[PDB]
Amino acid sequence: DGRVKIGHYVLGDTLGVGTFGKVKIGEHQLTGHKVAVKILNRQKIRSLDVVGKIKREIQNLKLFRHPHIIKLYQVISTPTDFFMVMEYVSGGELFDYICKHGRVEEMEARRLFQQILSAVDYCHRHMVVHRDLKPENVLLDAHMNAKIADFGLSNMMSDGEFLRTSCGSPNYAAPEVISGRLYAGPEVDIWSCGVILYALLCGTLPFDDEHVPTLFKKIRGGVFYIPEYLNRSVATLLMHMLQVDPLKRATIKDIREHEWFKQDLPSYLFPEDPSYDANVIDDEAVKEVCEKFECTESEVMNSLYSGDPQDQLAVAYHLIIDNRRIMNQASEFYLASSPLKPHPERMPPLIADKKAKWHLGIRSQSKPYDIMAEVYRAMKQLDFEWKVVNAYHLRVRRKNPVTGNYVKMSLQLYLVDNRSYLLDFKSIDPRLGSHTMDFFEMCASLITTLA
Amino acid sequence: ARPTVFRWTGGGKEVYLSGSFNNWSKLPLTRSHNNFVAILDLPEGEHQYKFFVDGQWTHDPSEPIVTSQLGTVNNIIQVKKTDFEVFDALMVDSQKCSDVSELSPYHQEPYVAPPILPPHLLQVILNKDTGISCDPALLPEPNHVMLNHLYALSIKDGVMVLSATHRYKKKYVTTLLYKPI
Amino acid sequence: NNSVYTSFMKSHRCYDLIPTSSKLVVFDTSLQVKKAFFALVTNGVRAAPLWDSKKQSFVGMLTITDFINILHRYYKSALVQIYELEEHKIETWREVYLQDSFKPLVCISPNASLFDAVSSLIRNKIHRLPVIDPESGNTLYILTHKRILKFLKLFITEFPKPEFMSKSLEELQIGTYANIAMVRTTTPVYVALGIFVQHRVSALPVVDEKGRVVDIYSKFDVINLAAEKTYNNLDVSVTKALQHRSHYFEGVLKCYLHETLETIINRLVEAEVHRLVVVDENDVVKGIVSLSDILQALVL
Ligand SMILES: CS(C)(O)Nc1ccc(-c2ccc(-c3nc4[nH]c(O[C@@H]5CO[C@H]6[C@@H]5OC[C@H]6O)nc4cc3Cl)cc2)cc1
Ligand SMILES: Nc1ncnc2c1ncn2[C@@H]1O[C@H](COP(=O)(O)O)[C@@H](O)[C@H]1O
Ligand SMILES: Nc1ncnc2c1ncn2[C@@H]1O[C@H](COP(=O)(O)O)[C@@H](O)[C@H]1O
């Protein structure tokens, strides 16, 4: 035979090598249908101890169904390797497109950017940050539609957790990423999108230098040149996305509200737009249907993609989405407005005889090792047990004598300013008691016994 | 049905694969830029094989070996049920990493510069005003990063006040506790 | 198509009604009860679940009705301190309060239906129902009639409208039209508190000499005695006690007997108030139509 076959696909040439894995083109032995096959070595995953990372990456791609994210069709497992059969796009990298053309004409740049952002928002809503967004990782189909690829550097956004992994291209990396600081995730993907927008419009990078230390300094500085051919509208958008201070940086909500972004925006791209629910699957609603009935996710999707309109599963699915729309359009009933006729239950302020401010954890001016020695002596006095994660990070435990359950919390020491420190308290995860009450009581007893 | 990869990275001009599965015939392998490969359908169990590189029998170092009564040294492979479904394979693989973790516990023994505080943790949900028109129990949507973290008011009277934002399915509750001390 | 709202109530979980993001104030029962009422004002909340540290469980709720009860029972004169308001812990006030009868914690699961929530509010004659997660044991939210009726109004377009929705208040007989607890313009605050304690009503229409509504003294308005720290003088008229909101008071929300149920529901949901005063041509009180009367009728 001679050819190399996996599934019904004959493997051809390498498309490229990503952050982790080798990508080859695959061609269907009967139809000639083309796929992109990502090969992952089992032994490499074991030796690098990244089994969980790969498991989640596969779980995420199996779940994702966005028109602007490369789709995972199947994964073929063998004794030595995993073969991820994915959607193939013939247009190649957005990178090469920007190089072929000079820069991209405003209308087509806007349209490609809207598609990239749509894909990035969908990731964030599913609690995933890409972390390696760049024109080389944005692929084009035969109709010039954008598709984000390579989730090799991606990570999960976990509750109460920060990311540190300094990863990706330096030209596309946010000031906090190149600085080795802790970051949330979404703001880091927003910065990269700012760089991609600048590249589409200008055909050049906003921060570039052959000498890496100068480049890093240019990024940290945030000074970049906005050409004259770029209108005042798009320039304000660029300036807001490429803010050095992550707290002042544009969010996807800020971008979606921007006049330049709203122009000619197709209605299927974001969840609150008219055509989104008709085209993009709601994974949570599919799960509700599987629960309410007793079916597979595929059984739900099949009645949607090729079923009858009156189908029991499709009816159930659309009723969840219709109800969700009612709720989503009564936004002031579910969330607080930013600072009309006052609400009838608005309380008058408490008269004295001053607005008190909430603060995070507890602060100390003492030396780090002296703060830690004080936490160790207060913990033993309270009969708390612990695990040292590192010098400034402990996992602490205590048994509730009434409910019998163990109570767990994480302690992190942080630097605030010059010799100003902060000790952070974070809950981990009671039926008989309350999990939140247990966390507050453990905290209160440690704060109280601390010097 | 049951694909098995035979890959040679050691280099050479021509590489052949022989084994129990083909009655020790020479199966010619195809090359990419470096790798010589073949994907065969093999049932579960033990399979003996050897590579033939440029007129010579060559040992594969990436796999275990077996020696026959007459001194024939062959590489050996195990084709398990768990190899043909990702999540079974990934579960087996993690177990090997956990087994390795053991070879390399709550206690009360203290340890033998701290990281810069993320600015996100300083965006205090209970310090920001919400606008008079809405229900006073309502709050804005929290950033996932500040969930589970503890906020407090300074001790005033003999009362300690603590709070934290916690997730319940897709909703968020900011609880405040008034506890005398 | 009468059971359309009962079927709706039965199909929806309490979870659906919970805000995406909200604030919940909890009090440990050993807390000084005056500190508890001030904490309600400072946090801008009406009710708080009660946590018993020794038992490791929620044992009840602290509401404005608790404040009405302490004031009425212990106030003696504007010349003397209300010692028990200054001295009692929640724990000790509750021993006194629930000395004669038995009353355990009334709560609901986030997975229980809205039908069960409405049933528990009426059956137990309460206004605040804590939603407690059985898995984590955490209180998530304090459910009310206001919240339930507003959630129901969002979906009234999603179903056929029953014929009773277009029927008048007179035909349907929803509400109270006899023995209406009311106060005069001159009625001392203490007297009004006595009326809340005896009649267990949530608001008193304030009437003139001719019997016409001029204002409304709701239980909510009593928390202003704690906010302004004017609780030690309950001799003051109900008018003087309401003066604080005269600059933003749009007037008394009322309805006529000839008006339809749908109109009344729409008026109540938009106004975000618990009841409307049923009046005649010349503003003379004829009855009360409360959210508890409405939900009882809709989910019957
Ligand atoms: C040129 S023509 C005429 O068109 N014919 C043609 C000839 C040969 C092939 C061909 C197909 C598959 C492989 C292959 N390569 C693997 N590399 C690997 O592991 C490595 C170690 O880790 C790295 C790296 O990979 C994952 C990373 O993580 N496992 C592998 C498995 C296989 Cl099957 C090699 C060549 C295709 C087509
Ligand atoms: N001021 C009042 N006088 C007499 N009955 C009332 C008054 N306010 C409410 N009611 C009735 O008392 C019951 C409980 O109402 P509420 O306390 O408003 O939830 C309902 O049946 C109301 O119609
Ligand atoms: N029918 C009404 N007309 C005008 N104000 C009202 C009415 N019902 C309640 N309020 C006011 O609305 C606030 C909340 O009261 P409640 O409806 O009892 O929760 C209080 O300040 C009441 O005085």
Query: What CATH number should be reported for the domain holding residue A390?
Result: 3.30.310.80
Residue A46 to residue B146, Cβ atoms within 8 A: no
**Under 8 Å between Cβ of C17 and C143:** yes
Nearest to residue C152, comparing CAs of C297, C12, C293, C300? C12
**Under 8 Å between Cβ of B106 and A385:** yes
Output the domain CATH number for residue A221.
1.10.510.10
Dihedral of alpha carbons C99, C103, C104, C106, sign: negative
Active site residue A132: yes
- Please name the residues in contact with A131: beta carbons below 8 A apart, sequence gap of 6 or more: A153, A154, A155, A165, A167, A168, A185, A188, A189
Q: How far, in Å, CA of A396 to CA of A372, rounded?
A: 13
Largest Cα–Cα distance of chain C, in whole Å?
61
- Please name the residues in contact with A210: beta carbons below 8 A apart, sequence gap of 6 or more: none
Domain boundaries, chain C: 3-300
Counting every residue, how long is chain A? 451
Residue type, A155: N
Radius of gyration of chain C, Cα coordinates, nearest whole angstrom: 20
Same domain for A99 and A79, yes or no, is no
Same domain for A169 and A133, yes or no, is yes
Strand, helix or coil for residue A146: strand
Question: Residue C45 corresponds to which tokens in the numbers above?
Answer: 């909340």
CA–CA distances in Å: residue A69 to residues A14, A119, A215, B35, C201: 21, 6, 30, 30, 59
**Under 8 Å between Cβ of C294 and C264:** yes
Domain-embedded: residue A151: yes
Radius of gyration of chain B, Cα coordinates, nearest whole angstrom: 31
Same domain for A102 and A202, yes or no, is yes
DSSP annotation of A352: P
C-beta of C287 in contact with ligand 2 (< 6 A): no
Q: How far, in Å, CA of A354 to CA of A369, rounded?
A: 36
C-beta of A65 in contact with ligand 1 (< 6 A): no
Residues of chain B contacting residue C138, judged by C-beta atoms under 8 Å apart: 166, 168, 173, 175
Q: How far, in Å, CA of A137 to CA of A23, rounded?
A: 13
Question: Residue A329 corresponds to which tokens in the numbers above?
Answer: 């359009």
Residues of chain C contacting residue A334, judged by C-beta atoms under 8 Å apart: 19-21
Q: How far, in Å, CA of C194 to CA of A116, rounded?
A: 66
- Please name the residues in contact with C169: beta carbons below 8 A apart, sequence gap of 6 or more: C175, C255, C256, C257, C258, C259, C260, C261, C264, C278, C289
Residues of chain B contacting residue C110, judged by C-beta atoms under 8 Å apart: 168-169
Domain-embedded: residue A303: no
Characterize the bridge pairing of strands C139-143 and A359-360: unpaired
Same domain for A143 and A76, yes or no, is no
Residues of chain B contacting residue A385, judged by C-beta atoms under 8 Å apart: 106-108
Domain-embedded: residue A275: no
Nearest to residue A372, comparing CAs of A411, A419, A410? A411
Edge-first strand listing for the sheet containing C275-279: C254-255, C275-279, C285-290
- HEC sequence for C68-107: HHHHHHHCCCCCCCCHHHHHCEHHHHHHHHCCCCCCCCCC
**Under 8 Å between Cβ of B87 and B51:** no
Ligand 3: residue whose CA is nearest its atom 12: A344
Neighbours of A438 (CB within 10 A): 25
- Please name the residues in contact with C108: beta carbons below 8 A apart, sequence gap of 6 or more: C14, C116, C117, C120, C129, C130, C131, C132, C143
**Under 8 Å between Cβ of A37 and A86:** yes
Q: How far, in Å, CA of C267 to CA of C271, rounded?
A: 6
The tokens 């704060």 sit on which residue? A447
Nearest to residue B3, comparing CAs of A39, A50, A152? A39
Q: How far, in Å, CA of A442 to CA of A386, rounded?
A: 13
CA–CA distances in Å: residue C103 to residues A135, A313, C29, C33, C94: 66, 45, 16, 19, 11
A223 is in an annotated binding site: no
Partner A, chain B 6-65, Cβ-Cβ below 8 Å: 7, 28, 30, 32-33, 37-39, 62
Question: Residue B65 corresponds to which tokens in the numbers above?
Answer: 């070996």
User: Which subunits sit against A, judged by 3+ Cβ pairs under 8 A?
Assistant: B, C
The tokens 């005003």 sit on which residue? B129
Largest Cα–Cα distance of chain B, in whole Å?
91
- Please name the residues in contact with A26: beta carbons below 8 A apart, sequence gap of 6 or more: A6, A7, A9, A10, A11, A12, A34, A35, A36, A37, A85, A88
CA–CA distances in Å: residue B156 to residues A100, A356, B161, B178: 67, 10, 9, 11
Sequential DSSP letters for B111-155: ---PPBPPGGGG--TTTS---TTS-TTB-PPPPGGGTTB-EEEEE
Q: How far, in Å, CA of A115 to CA of A279, rounded?
A: 14
Characterize the bridge pairing of strands C254-255 and C275-279: parallel
Closest atom of ligand 3 to CA, residue C273: 17
Same domain for A72 and A115, yes or no, is no
The tokens 């990782």 sit on which residue? A137
Characterize the bridge pairing of strands A393-399 and A385-390: antiparallel
Dihedral of alpha carbons A122, A128, A131, A136, sign: negative
C-beta of C149 in contact with ligand 2 (< 6 A): no
Q: How far is C277 from chain A (nearest CA, A)?
A: 16
Sequential DSSP letters for A166-187: --S-GGG--HHHHTT--B-SHH
C53: closest chain B residue by CA: B179
Q: How far, in Å, CA of C184 to CA of C210, rounded?
A: 10
- Please name the residues in contact with A359: beta carbons below 8 A apart, sequence gap of 6 or more: B124, B151, B152, B153, B154
Residue C19 to residue B179, Cβ atoms within 8 A: no
CA–CA distances in Å: residue B63 to residues A81, A329, B8, B100: 14, 61, 11, 19
The tokens 């590249």 sit on which residue? A199
Question: Residue A1 corresponds to which tokens in the numbers above?
Answer: 């035979």
**Under 8 Å between Cβ of A94 and A112:** yes
Question: Residue A330 corresponds to which tokens in the numbers above?
Answer: 């009564």
Same domain for A36 and A148, yes or no, is no
Q: How far is C257 from chain A (nearest CA, A)?
A: 25
Where helices occur in chain C by DSSP H, the ranges are: 4-11, 33-42, 64-74, 83-87, 90-97, 114-123, 145-154, 169-172, 189-199, 224-227, 238-242, 261-271, 291-298
A85 is in an annotated binding site: no
Strand, helix or coil for residue C12: coil
Question: Residue A317 corresponds to which tokens in the numbers above?
Answer: 């699915």
Domain-embedded: residue A316: no
Dihedral of alpha carbons A228, A230, A232, A236, sign: negative
Same domain for A197 and A246, yes or no, is yes
A374, A436, A437, A446: which to substitute to probe chain B, counting the most B Cβ within 10 Å?
A: A436
Cα within 13 Å of Cα(A137), Cβ side: 25
Question: Residue A82 corresponds to which tokens in the numbers above?
Answer: 């995993």
Q: How far, in Å, CA of A224 to CA of A206, rounded?
A: 5
* Beta-sheet strands, E only, within A29-123: 34-41, 72-77, 81-87
Q: How far is B158 from chain C (nearest CA, A)?
A: 9
Where helices occur in A350-403 by DSSP H, the ranges are: 368-381
DSSP annotation of C162: P
Neighbours of A135 (CB within 10 A): 24
Nearest to residue C235, comparing CAs of C201, C195, C200, C192? C192
Kindly give the distance from the C-alpha atom of residue B17 to the centroid of ligand 1, in angstroms, as a whole number: 16
List Cβ<8 Å contacts ≥24 apart for A333-336: A333/B135, A333/C19, A333/C150, A333/C151, A333/C154, A334/C19, A334/C20, A334/C21, A335/B138, A335/B139, A335/B140, A335/B141, A335/C19, A335/C20, A335/C21, A336/B130, A336/B131, A336/B134, A336/B135, A336/B138, A336/B139, A336/B140, A336/C21
Sequential DSSP letters for A241-300: HT-SSTTTSPPHHHHHH-HHHHTT--TTSSTTSTTHHHHS--HHHHHHHHHHTT--HHHH
Ligand 2: residue whose CA is nearest its atom 6: C201
Nearest to residue B37, comparing CAs of B59, B16, B66, B55? B16
Output the domain CATH number for residue A13.
3.30.200.20
Sequential DSSP letters for C182-211: -EETT-BHHHHHHHHHHH--SEEEEE-TTS
Same domain for A12 and A129, yes or no, is no
Of the residues A246, A262, A278, the one at which a domain ends: A262
Residues of chain B contacting residue A284, judged by C-beta atoms under 8 Å apart: 170
C-beta of C221 in contact with ligand 3 (< 6 A): yes
Characterize the bridge pairing of strands C21-28 and C48-52: parallel
**Under 8 Å between Cβ of C288 and C180:** yes
DSSP annotation of A162: -
Of the residues A21, A52, A87, the one at which a domain ends: A87
Q: How far, in Å, CA of A334 to CA of C219, rounded?
A: 26
Q: Annotate A262-286 with b (16+ C-beta within 10 A) or e (fewer).
A: eeeeeeebbeeeeebbeebbbeebb
Q: Annotate B145-179 with b (16+ C-beta within 10 A) or e (fewer).
A: bbbbbbbbbeeeeebbbbbbbbebeebbbbbbbbb
CA–CA distances in Å: residue A301 to residues A156, A275, A276, A294, A318: 25, 18, 16, 14, 12
- Please name the residues in contact with C80: beta carbons below 8 A apart, sequence gap of 6 or more: none
Dihedral of alpha carbons A55, A56, A60, A61, sign: negative
Same domain for A147 and A184, yes or no, is yes
Q: How far is B18 from chain A (nearest CA, A)?
A: 15
A384 is in an annotated binding site: no
Write out the residue range of the structural domain in which residue A381 sits. Answer: 362-449
Domain-embedded: residue A322: no
Ligand nearest to the CA of C199: 2
- Please name the residues in contact with C148: beta carbons below 8 A apart, sequence gap of 6 or more: C17, C114, C117, C118, C121, C295
What is chain C's percent helix, strand, coil content, to nearest 5? 40, 20, 35
Q: How far, in Å, CA of C133 to CA of A288, rounded?
A: 19
Kindly give the distance from the C-alpha atom of residue B152 to the centroid of ligand 2, in angstroms, as a whole number: 40
Nearest to residue A159, comparing CAs of A119, A127, A181, A130? A127
Check CB contact of A361 with chain B, cutoff 8 Å.
yes
Q: How far, in Å, CA of C49 to CA of C29, rounded?
A: 10
CA–CA distances in Å: residue B166 to residues A5, B176, C32, C58: 50, 11, 27, 18
Of the residues A262, A285, A312, the one at which a domain ends: A262
Binding residues of C: 46, 61-66, 106, 127-128, 146, 176, 181, 202-203, 218-221, 245, 253, 274-275, 290-293
Characterize the bridge pairing of strands A72-77 and A22-28: unpaired
Number of domains present in the structure of chain A = 3
Nearest to residue A16, comparing CAs of A120, A80, A86? A86
The tokens 């004409």 sit on which residue? A105
C-beta of A152 in contact with ligand 1 (< 6 A): no
**φ and ψ of A322, to 5 deg:** -65, -45
Same domain for A239 and A109, yes or no, is yes
Neighbours of A154 (CB within 10 A): 21
Q: How far, in Å, CA of A185 to CA of A424, rounded?
A: 20
CA–CA distances in Å: residue A238 to residues A99, A169, A194, A264: 21, 19, 6, 18
Check CB contact of A368 with chain B, cutoff 8 Å.
yes
Same domain for A110 and A234, yes or no, is yes
- Please name the residues in contact with C240: beta carbons below 8 A apart, sequence gap of 6 or more: none
**Under 8 Å between Cβ of B89 and A77:** yes
Same domain for A255 and A109, yes or no, is yes
**Under 8 Å between Cβ of A216 and A203:** no
Dihedral of alpha carbons A377, A383, A384, A388, sign: positive
Strand, helix or coil for residue A44: helix
Of the candidates A132, A150, A189, A277, the residue annotated as catalytic is A132
The tokens 């995993």 sit on which residue? A82
Asked how this structure was determined, the answer is X-ray
**Under 8 Å between Cβ of C190 and C167:** no
B180: closest chain C residue by CA: C31
- Please name the residues in contact with B29: beta carbons below 8 A apart, sequence gap of 6 or more: B6, B8, B15, B16, B17, B36, B37, B38
C147: closest chain B residue by CA: B135
Nearest 5°: the CA angle B77, B81, B87 is 110
Q: How far, in Å, CA of A364 to CA of A420, rounded?
A: 6
A244 is in an annotated binding site: no
Bridge partners (DSSP) of residue A85 are A37, A74
Q: Which of C198, C201, C279 should be mutated for ligand 2, with most atoms under 8 A from CB?
A: C201
Residue A348 to residue C41, Cβ atoms within 8 A: yes
Query: Is residue A294 exposed (0-12), middle (13-18) or buried (19+ Cβ within 10 Å)?
Result: exposed
Q: Which of A19, A39, A85 should be mutated for ligand 1, with most atoms under 8 A from CB?
A: A39
How many contacts does A have with C, using Cβ atoms within 8 A?
Answer: 91
**φ and ψ of A271, to 5 deg:** -60, -20
Ligand nearest to the CA of C288: 2
Partner B, chain C 137-156, Cβ-Cβ below 8 Å: 138-142
Nearest to residue C272, comparing CAs of B141, B130, B136? B136
